[PDB]
């Protein structure tokens, strides 16, 4: 039952027990003291053993753990050191973003998306910008889509540095964490020069970007590109061929390609299992068709494979950054429609038509024609998509966000079952969890 619980040899009929001084029944009322007179052997499988159900050691991999990328009450049920069942408790960071967007305009709802994933900002707001652009039936000009491709790559480098190095740090390699974080400081300079804030760059707005690139940014972006090429090499020096790094990750968290599709995994934990699918290729967008790059596909579906794919994503992203700097076109950076973009300040105070649209954009907002859409992009974690329903109003009606880290954490039970408690950290690290995105 709920609180406690209760054959090969032949069932042998023995009756008529006798001793040398009488029968079994003659001394029955006295033999309980005589331990050598008992008739219930203790080796019998049918012997009544009633033992209380003492629950197994359930350690809380709870919020106050450095391995956690947020506040995760990972209720782990373990016997010994193996993993029996895992039940993550997401929601400790449910800020209710989906509820708040319904009451704010399409321009005011953009800064919510930078706060989903703390590290992949300009990719997050790109998927809402594309969603609104798809409904608005307006297309960003060429130079706008090249800026989104360049900062699409820089964001991927920023995200993967947080993902790979913390995964390396959580294993125990402290040094590669600090070498890479200087590069993030160097990369966050580029975010701050174009947008103003280091981390949450409300830059990619529906209808292009916020402001044109500052002069000389390309020179500084390219100069970092030459130096950055060595940074991966030293990262691959202390991780790629080290035997301790291989032992911690090889064969840890095996995910079949057929089973990865079943749980809807996307991103690195779908090419780690061998499927050569990539959203940047399946649905080209924002000047990704123009550039050329090679996708990476694993063969064993374990953490070490996903590491190699993520490291390859560094060089392939750096490959595009060279192409985006070289192939940069001239022109505007946002759609030249005053109804979906603020007019320049030189013209707002000179032209009566310009001032009216500036006044009207910021008080009522632009109205999105009715419809519904589901646009998915290759986020650094995986397939990130938003389901947006337009009710002809200047405020979206329904905004459901597909978080790649949300689905992956669900497949923790399928992946981590049968591994050891140290392998739990490796599995979490390779999932690239950011519980702001999980609990959107």
């Amino acid at each position: 039952n709920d609180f406690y619980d209760v054959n090969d040899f032949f069932p042998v009929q023995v009756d008529g027990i006798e001793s040398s001084l009488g029968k079994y029944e003659e001394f029955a009322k006295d033999a309980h003291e005589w331990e050598s007179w008992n008739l219930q052997n203790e080796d019998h499988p049918e012997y009544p053993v009633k033992r209380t159900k003492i629950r197994h050691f359930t350690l809380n991999f709870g919020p106050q753990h450095p391995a956690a990328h947020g506040v995760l009450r990972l209720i782990l049920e373990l016997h010994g050191e193996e993993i029996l069942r895992s039940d993550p408790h997401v929601g400790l960071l449910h800020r209710g973003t989906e509820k708040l967007i319904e009451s704010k305009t399409y321009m005011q709802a953009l800064p919510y998306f930078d706060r989903l994933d703390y590290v992949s900002m300009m990719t997050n707001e790109q998927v809402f910008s594309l969603a609104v652009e798809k409904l608005l039936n307006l297309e960003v000009p060429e130079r706008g889509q090249y800026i989104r491709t360049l900062f699409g790559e820089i964001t991927r480098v920023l995200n993967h540095l947080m993902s790979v190095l913390s995964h390396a740090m959580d294993v125990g390699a402290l040094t590669p964490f600090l070498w890479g974080f200087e590069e993030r400081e160097k990369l966050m300079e580029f975010y701050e020069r174009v947008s103003g804030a280091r981390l949450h760059s409300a830059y990619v707005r529906p209808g292009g970007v916020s402001q044109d690139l500052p002069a000389g940014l390309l020179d500084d972006i390219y100069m970092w590109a030459t130096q950055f090429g060595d940074r991966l090499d030293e990262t691959e020096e202390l991780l790629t061929d080290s035997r301790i790094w291989k032992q911690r990750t090889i064969g840890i968290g095996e995910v079949t390609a057929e089973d990865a599709l079943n749980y809807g995994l996307s991103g690195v934990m779908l090419r780690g299992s061998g499927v050569p699918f990539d959203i940047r290729k399946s649905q080209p967008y924002d000047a990704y068709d123009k550039v050329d790059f090679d996708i990476a596909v694993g063969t064993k579906g374990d953490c070490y494979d996903r590491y190699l794919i993520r490291m390859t994503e560094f060089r392939q992203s750096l490959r595009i950054i060279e192409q985006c700097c070289n192939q940069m076109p001239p022109g505007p950076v946002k759609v030249e429609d005053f109804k979906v973009a603020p007019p320049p300040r030189a013209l707002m105070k000179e032209d009566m038509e310009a001032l009216i649209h500036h006044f009207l954009l910021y008080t009522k907002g632009y109205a999105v024609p009715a419809g519904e859409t589901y646009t998915a992009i290759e986020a650094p974690k995986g397939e990130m998509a938003v389901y947006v329903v337009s009710d002809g109003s200047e405020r979206p009606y329904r905004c459901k966000i597909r978080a790649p880290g949300f689905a992956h954490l669900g497949a923790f039970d399928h992946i981590a079952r049968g591994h050891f408690l140290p392998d739990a950290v490796a599995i979490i690290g390779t999932m690239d969890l950011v519980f702001g995105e999980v609990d959107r």
Partner: protein, 93 residues
């Protein structure tokens, strides 16, 4: 071993039954539960759970709708009484 006999269950059963609102204070094997004591669903469950707390025997879902008399519970405990397993310290030393 199972040290409970039929009388031991019967004698201690009344005291628990004397602790709950019963139409008559005369309860024996023939006494019913729903009829004699006027107990409905929720009233009867508390007494049945209470006997689980004293006799330390769990009643399953099959017998739930099939309990009609108090003699059955008294006889049921004997068929379903075991001593909890004692740790290695208690058993042999």
């Amino acid at each position: 071993a199972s040290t409970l006999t039929k009388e031991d269950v019967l004698t201690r059963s009344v005291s628990v039954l004397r602790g709950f609102e019963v139409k008559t204070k005369d309860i024996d094997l023939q006494t019913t539960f729903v009829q004699d004591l006027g107990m409905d669903s929720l009233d009867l469950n508390d007494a049945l759970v209470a006997l689980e707390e004293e006799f330390d025997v769990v009643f399953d879902d099959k017998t739930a709708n099939e309990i009609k008399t108090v003699g059955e519970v008294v006889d049921f405990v004997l068929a379903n009484y075991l001593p909890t397993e004692q740790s290695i310290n208690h058993t042999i030393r």
